[PDB]
Symmetry: C3
Amino acid sequence: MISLNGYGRFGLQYVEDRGVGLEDTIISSRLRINIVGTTETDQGVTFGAKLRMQWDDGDAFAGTAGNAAQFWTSYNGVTVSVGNVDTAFDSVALTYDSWMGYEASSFGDAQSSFFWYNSKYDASGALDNYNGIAVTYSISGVNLYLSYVDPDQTVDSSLVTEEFGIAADWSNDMISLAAAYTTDAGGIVDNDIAFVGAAYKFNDAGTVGLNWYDNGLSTAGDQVTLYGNYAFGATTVRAYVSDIDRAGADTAYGIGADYQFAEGVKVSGSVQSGFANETVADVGVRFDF
Amino acid sequence: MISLNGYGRFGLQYVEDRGVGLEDTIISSRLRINIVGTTETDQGVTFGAKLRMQWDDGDAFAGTAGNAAQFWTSYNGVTVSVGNVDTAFDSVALTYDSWMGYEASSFGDAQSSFFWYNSKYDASGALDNYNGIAVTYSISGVNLYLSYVDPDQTVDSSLVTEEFGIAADWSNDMISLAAAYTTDAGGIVDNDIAFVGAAYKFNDAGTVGLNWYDNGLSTAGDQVTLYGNYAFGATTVRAYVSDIDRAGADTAYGIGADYQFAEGVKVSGSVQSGFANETVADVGVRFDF
Amino acid sequence: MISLNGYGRFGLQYVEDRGVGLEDTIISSRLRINIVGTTETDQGVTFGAKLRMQWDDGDAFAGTAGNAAQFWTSYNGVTVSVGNVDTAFDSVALTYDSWMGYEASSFGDAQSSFFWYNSKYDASGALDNYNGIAVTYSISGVNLYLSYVDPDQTVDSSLVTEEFGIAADWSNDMISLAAAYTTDAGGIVDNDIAFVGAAYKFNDAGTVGLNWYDNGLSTAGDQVTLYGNYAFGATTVRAYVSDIDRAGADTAYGIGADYQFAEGVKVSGSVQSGFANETVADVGVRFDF
Ligand SMILES: CCCCCCCCOCCOCCOCCOCCO
Ligand SMILES: CCCCCCCCOCCOCCOCCOCCO
Ligand SMILES: CCCCCCCCOCCOCCOCCOCCO
Ligand SMILES: CCCCCCCCOCCOCCOCCOCCO
Ligand SMILES: CCCCCCCCOCCOCCOCCOCCO
Ligand SMILES: CCCCCCCCOCCOCCOCCOCCO
Ligand SMILES: CCCCCCCCOCCOCCOCCOCCO
Ligand SMILES: CCCCCCCCOCCOCCOCCOCCO
Ligand SMILES: CCCCCCCCOCCOCCOCCOCCO
Ligand SMILES: [Mg+2]
Ligand SMILES: [Mg+2]
Ligand SMILES: [Mg+2]
């Protein structure tokens, strides 16, 4: 069986003083198409394969291509994936919950380098022999994630640096806890990163959370992000503040709102301020199909 | 929801004396696949996104890629589109009705340069930050079209030339009228083009029309195309004659036929003569799927 | 109508002493997606078009693109195809029946150069004006195949070498016979190749066959491959031995097994030895969707 799903998004993206001779405000848009092939068996084992075709405004050649394939095998809550995998640091819950605006971005996200699912081709040739293995296991409320990425699997393993990651999250109706740790993140020797987060659903309407990160060799040093969101009917209000250890850094912060226009249609906007005083703002729509 | 549609076409394409060491007759073919994502809402607003994958014989690398995305929002007869848009000069009725043969071509088409929907990627890098906005409005019989194309939206607007186009068509059962005007067509300063056309359905079987163009900075100068077509059951006969103001130009003319083999299957052929005495002929099939 | 089908495969691929500084064992995988457009008519003539998107581990840019299109017209057992066609030497029965392992490979396959369906783009530019015509005709048990490939159809025909191929196979319940002949195979002047094969189904469980080849200008010279396979319920055991005329060559041989885990899911493995003493082994899964 083959299924297709995806989303389109478009709107305005403002970056205060983007560059000499550059427009501060542009129309930023993205089209994402996922192609999923699945083979269900009567033994209860599912085999799947996925390809992504994603286009972003500004992409080279004004064209769209597919990325590198991902394969998986699923059985009784256990999923083993091979190829262009989702990694543990990128898959755990809570780590991206300060996201806001129609481009779902946040200075409050971890400021470190690590591997993640590659949505597109890479013209440098760097990902040509990149291969990962990932294992996920889900119990009721517990999620365990394991990932191993070899950036160049054809070369002897002792000559290249592999990324190894582990992560777990747990949640009940009101409290959520999550943690992750990855050694040699991004294939960088000694870039060891970690995350610990917690969130409290202090109503059926609000949430407040706190994420803490060790960003390894990144110049940001350790980081803390405090975020919260509140739903008023169809409109959701979001905010966050984040601090890094880098000497002289500013406190980053953002404020935004989402409006659920219809099932699958979300109008979003945000005003954010970065660690180096960058001012960014956006307003747009995302529609899922 | 995601839908796929398209067409295939193949046949013979003859160009008298194509070139030294070249075959005059070749097998010319095209595969076109459109990927359309749509999100319908109960408020009556539809969101859509589209991608095209088109291959033509002779294409570089013997491969097919997707183009740059188009997004739209529709409500009550009004459609706003963003990204790789259809422009007003290319969308108006009548302007392409002298087309003939299985490759749907005609020397009688406007001899000017202007932007249009980009079916493919562009290896030059020229379309990388190209972005358009288009608005269409349809009443019963009236169609209004507006388009604005910025060839490089990241650069300050006063440093680049934007194309602005406007067009409208109207029709009842027998008479059709259409007009268009575009300033700085194709991003060329002072390339201002215009079109005015009219067609008369002098039966339920025949049509005769006349298109007039101002081709802006093109060397062709003003142009007039007179065309007609007549249906005899499943077979349609077509002809046209066209004249440009260029000094020394020949009258262009063409004669062709279509045969509707089945719903979605059209066999077509044409013999055409250009403004510089070029002789072209074709015969092939188009099938829609 | 547009349909999508394909397969995914992944597993281990071992090549004894692959290279200095290289890993002998790698994770080898392939994703194949076929896009088929078809137009059925009430006259009984079907028109079709096909595109393929295939990714293999190690592919340049860690991306996937479509190949060059194939078009066909079918009526009463006769199929005419144009464009990126399947050729007669590659389409006949029996010639690939010594295949084994999850990568379906065999040293026992013909050691010659010839054109075949191109699954992917070609960055060299070599296939840009490549065009084929192929005609197949199937009676009850008889299959006839004809193919003509022009590697650069834009250039005068007397300046380029075209491949012409013919093939036929016949089978009843127990005996199968097949033969093929191709002149200027692969666009190489005087590379004339041939094949003759026969297979005997000596049960409802086993098969033994013998393929013979004339490999034209290849250094392998003539070749003989003897293969057999036996089904034990869901598990199939396969073997082959092959000899070439090249001076000093070793006898190639392979042994493998398939396990039909479920409809559309096949687990396969093989250990093979080549004509130059190469030792290859594989183990993996293929799943069809
Ligand atoms: C009006 C044509 C010339 C001006 C071009 C500058 C472009 C600014 O126009 C904004 C028109 O809006 C379209 C873009 O998508 C973002 C809109 O907001 C999203 C939905 O809430
Ligand atoms: C095989 C799938 C198609 C992907 C191949 C595209 C290869 C293009 O690059 C060829 C070499 O030139 C380098 C391109 O510049 C970088 C492009 O991507 C950056 C995103 O905007
Ligand atoms: C300057 C060029 C255009 C860029 C402007 C985009 C700015 C869009 O607005 C930012 C979104 O901020 C809204 C605030 O959150 C407050 C609450 O009320 C909203 C829910 O109804
Ligand atoms: C016959 C093989 C060698 C000659 C090759 C030259 C190619 C000319 O052959 C034309 C065969 O036709 C196939 C092409 O599609 C166009 C046919 O007309 C379209 C349907 O009315
Ligand atoms: C990202 C989608 C794939 C499109 C990228 C293809 C990029 C190929 O070009 C890389 C640089 O070399 C230039 C190619 O020559 C022109 C090709 O297209 C002309 C149509 O025949
Ligand atoms: C010289 C190489 C092959 C190229 C030949 C293609 C020429 C095909 O014919 C052109 C089509 O012209 C047909 C004429 O219109 C007349 C009416 O009767 C047709 C409807 O039944
Ligand atoms: C365990 C992580 C580190 C070791 C990486 C070396 C990779 C070898 O691991 C093999 C794990 O298997 C996944 C690959 O697909 C092939 C398995 O066999 C196919 C099904 O019968
Ligand atoms: C138009 C469809 C996209 C295919 C175009 C990709 C073009 C990439 O090449 C641009 C020039 O550089 C040469 C690439 O190196 C060879 C790649 O393929 C070999 C398979 O691993
Ligand atoms: C050395 C690294 C890993 C590579 C090992 C792949 C080797 C896999 O095994 C080869 C398959 O050979 C099996 C034999 O046929 C014998 C019969 O019994 C099998 C059916 O149940
Ligand atoms: Mg963008
Ligand atoms: Mg062509
Ligand atoms: Mg491989």
